[PDB]
């Protein structure tokens, strides 16, 4: 999948 930070954090 995608790193959690690139998906959900800004």
């Amino acid at each position, epitope marked *: 999948h995608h790193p959690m930070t690139e998906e*959900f954090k800004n």
Partner: antibody, heavy 112, light 113 residues
Framework: QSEEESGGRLVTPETPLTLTCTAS????????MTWVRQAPGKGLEWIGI?????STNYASWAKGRFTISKTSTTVDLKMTSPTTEDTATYFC?????????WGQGTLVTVSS | QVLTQTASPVSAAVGNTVTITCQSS????????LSWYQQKLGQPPKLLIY???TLASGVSSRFKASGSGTQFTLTISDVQCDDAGTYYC?????????????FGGGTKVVVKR
């Protein structure tokens, strides 16, 4: 660079309801987007998030009753088994870590 | 997660200072992913602070904030009448082992007169 929610209305319990957050001037592929709610006189409550590429996460308390999805211009919140405790103003907001842009909110009433 | 804020109300005369504390039940993402908001009745919240201490664009420098881990404070200096309102902290957490985000309970600021 603006958000506007719509779809808030009176529904009976267990009747599904979809709210729409319409974005203007935002590329929704570049931002996590969040739904928050506030019951009258109460505090803000985080419901969930749709990430940049479309993955989703939700509050533990939601128990799968909320589904967020998005298009290139909108973010939807679908609520599936509403109860009277879901009566609130629902806000969409831009951001995943923190929220810099907000809609004005749309008011959902769950009642017979 | 539960973020516990200062009990309401916090009160101050115009030109005075108030602080609002926000304690997270668990450490926030990277120890500083914590933001602060002002809300007036009938309006959406307004971002004041992000990453625990960074002033949001266009917000008065009267607002400052600090903290790390589980412990955070917002300070409003030179209080003005339009500071009356409710202030919230938002924690950001590791989505893989917790809820991604949570709101504190809110703290009402009352301007003395």
């Amino acid at each position: 660079q603006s958000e506007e929610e719509s779809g808030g209305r009176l529904v009976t319990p267990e009747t599904p309801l979809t709210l729409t957050c319409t974005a203007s001037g935002i590329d929704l592929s570049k931002w996590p987007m969040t739904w928050v709610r506030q019951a009258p006189g109460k505090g803000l409550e985080w419901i969930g998030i749709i990430g940049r590429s479309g993955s989703t996460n939700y509050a533990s308390w939601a128990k799968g009753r909320f589904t967020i999805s998005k298009t290139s211009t909108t973010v939807d919140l679908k609520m599936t088994s509403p109860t009277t405790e879901d009566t609130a103003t629902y806000f969409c907001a831009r951001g995943g870590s923190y929220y810099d842009l907000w809609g004005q909110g749309t008011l959902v009433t769950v009642s017979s | 997660q539960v973020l516990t804020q200062t009990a309401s109300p916090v009160s101050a005369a115009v030109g005075n200072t108030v602080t609002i504390t926000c304690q997270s039940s668990q450490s926030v993402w990277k120890n500083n992913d914590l933001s602060w908001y002002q809300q007036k009745l009938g309006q959406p919240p307004k971002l004041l602070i992000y990453y625990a201490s960074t002033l949001a664009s266009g917000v008065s420098s009267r607002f400052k904030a600090s903290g790390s881990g589980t412990q955070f404070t917002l300070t409003i200096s030179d209080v003005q009448c339009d500071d009356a309102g409710t202030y919230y902290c938002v924690g950001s957490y590791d989505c893989s082992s917790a809820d991604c985000n949570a709101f504190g309970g809110g703290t009402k600021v009352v301007v003395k007169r």
